[PDB]
């Protein structure tokens, strides 16, 4: 399997663990926002996977683009009515990176509700590509992920859509995921997944190739049983309606475990 | 900075990008190159977004350089280290003699040794051809243009299908495979081994249909014990003429056991089965490998 890279795949694992810490958002950067806030993120964010929805776009690209605007306002300070637009320009240039077939400028402009202009949006990307210093080859959850899901004996569809569904959900709450890494989110997700639908753990060959156990994984994955718990309830939830799509095995639709027997 | 500092020499190239112009750091005295991507309706091209972030983390002996960014209202200029010559130009300079087994051999490593670094570091350069393939006076020869080039992740995801310089391209692209993967970098790189020996092209077609036809006719028309899963492929059809291999050593005729073996593995039809760069580092062929000067003035 020339796909599954075996001559590389030790080596660019090893990349992408130095890349994530290189490319992390400050952990504590919405209380040094004075004018946006956790909740208006997750607003924004709920609307970039309804856009992605609309255009048809990867999810690698809607995880792009969070860890994008996520950077931007860990050194910049941006008003409420501003939000929008640097999330606007973080999709477009994600999509450019990311996309076989990018959606137009124009596109993009349209999806504001002509909130913006073309001229905002073109001068945003050129901001955001300043601030970030060209640096877009960002480890996401969905790179990891990939990779665990090559530890499955045997492969389960259903484990895979919901680790990507709840990689996702992580994706809407700065508070707590901002704390954790992409590689860890990405384990906890697979885990949790593992376990919803096959009863089965995190793996000792998963132990192997990333250091990670249980112990370790412990804090986030608490974190995500009580996100997939409170789902249904959550103010955004794009997402779920997402997942509910056969494209993803309807997977928003499985009932999370009250327990994880940790 | 800058680009106060920088005096343009000449121009050394074009295409798209971009141009490409030889100049010279004022306070300094570096020697560069810039290329130059022209802004405007549709933004920063997503062939200048992988280009920069690529080549911003791709730090190695044979691997063109990027040296700055200079990003402007309008203008945008990647500064580069400049390399004398282009391995295309360097061929073509070296008919009646051809080029030296010991300066191809080291190019050859240098270049493996570049791709291996690309692929470990999940990127794919997507156009390896003469063209894109630098020399200087001190025997270095590096990769250049990512301007086609892409992240990947692991395991790989449907890319562009485009993609690779038709002489380059690889037969599970040509024959529409849902993915293709590392091995595609390694088929080029063989058609350019081939090509350093014999100053020509190795599969020269003029269209998808007559390159897949002329690679047949080389390497024989590849059946389910070659290659796996090939007859269920896409564009294969059961109509393609049937060729037999031919005698290898019939493909690059002066090139010898250890080169041909080599060879042959970078050109096996079976993405799974042909070599990676890694490993083609350990071939016998390069044994006695050393990096001399090119033989002729740049
Ligand atoms: C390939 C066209 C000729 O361009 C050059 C000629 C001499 N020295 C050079 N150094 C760097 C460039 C170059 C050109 C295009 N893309 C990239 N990444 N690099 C270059
Ligand atoms: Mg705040």
Known sequence: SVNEVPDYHEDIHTYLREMEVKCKP??????????????MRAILVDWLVEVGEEYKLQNETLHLAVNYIDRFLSSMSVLRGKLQLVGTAAMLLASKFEEIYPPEVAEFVYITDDTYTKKQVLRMEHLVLKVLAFDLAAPTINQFLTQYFL???????????????????SLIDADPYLKYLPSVIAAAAFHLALYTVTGQSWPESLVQKTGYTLETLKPCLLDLHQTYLRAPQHAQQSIREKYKNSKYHGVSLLNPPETLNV | GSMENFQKVEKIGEGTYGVVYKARNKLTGEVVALKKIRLDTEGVPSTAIREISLLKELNHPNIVKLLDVIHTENKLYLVFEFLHQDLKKFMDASAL?????????????QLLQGLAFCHSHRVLHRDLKPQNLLINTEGAIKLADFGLARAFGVPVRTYTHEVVTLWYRAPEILLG????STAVDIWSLGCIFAEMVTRRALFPGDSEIDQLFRIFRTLGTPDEVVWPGVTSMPDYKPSFPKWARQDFSKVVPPLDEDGRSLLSQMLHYDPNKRISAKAALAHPFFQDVTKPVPHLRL
Do not use: R, W
């Open chain 1, 26 to 39: 400050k952990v504590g950067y919405m209380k040094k926002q004075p004018d946006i806030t956790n909740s």
């Open chain 2, 97 to 109: 003699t051809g080029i030296p087994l010991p300066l191809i051999k080291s190019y050859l490593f």
């Open chain 1, 151 to 169: 530890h499955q004996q045997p492969a389960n569809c259903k484990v895979e859509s919901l680790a990507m569904f709840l990689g996702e959900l």
């Open chain 2, 177 to 180: 495979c849902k993915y293709y």
